[PDB]
């Protein structure tokens, strides 16, 4: 699709058996989701943005589906104020900025 930026670019994702809404975020290195359960190994991480840092759990090799596009990547889970899809997954569905 072509997604306008007049509004926040929100999409549905499918992950860990769940449907969630998330923001397509070209400014984010990483994908970060609100507290949820995911299978397999994880390790702690600090990530930073405006306002400073939060501690998250890093899960690797997680299948995700975004607008019908399947991908796999790292997902961070923790007390983020909103769900964001970061560049690490945006690349995999072939998402570009255009003007």
Ligand X SMILES: C=CCNC(=O)[C@@H](NC(=O)[C@@](O)(CCCN(Cc1ccc(-c2ccncc2)cc1)NC(=O)[C@@H](NC(=O)OC)C(C)(C)C)Cc1ccc(CC=C)cc1)C(C)C
- Nearer of residues 49 and 63 to ligand X, judged by Cβ: 49
The contact mask relative to Cl ion for 55-84 (x = CB under 5 A, - = no) is ------------------xx----------
Question: CA 21 from chain center: how many Å?
Answer: 10
- Nearer of residues 39 and 44 to a second copy, judged by Cβ: 44
Work out whether 34 is an interface residue with a second copy (CB under 8 A).
no
Cα 25 to Cα 33, 60, 97: the distances in Å are 12, 19, 11
Say how far apart CA 94 and CA 85 lie, in whole Å. Answer: 13
Q: Which of residues 8-47 bind ligand X (CB under 6 A)?
A: 23, 25, 27-30, 32, 47
Strands 31-33 and 18-24: unpaired
């Amino acid at each position: 699709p072509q997604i306008t930026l007049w509004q926040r670019p929100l999409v549905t994702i499918k992950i860990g058996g769940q449907l969630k809404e998330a923001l397509l975020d070209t400014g984010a290195d990483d994908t970060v989701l609100e507290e949820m359960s995911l299978p397999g190994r994880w390790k702690p991480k600090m990530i930073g943005g405006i306002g400073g840092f939060i501690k998250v759990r890093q899960y690797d090799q997680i299948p995700i589906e975004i607008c019908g596009h399947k991908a796999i990547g790292t997902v961070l889970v923790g007390p983020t104020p909103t769900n964001v899809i970061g560049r690490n997954l945006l690349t995999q569905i072939g998402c570009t900025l255009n003007f």
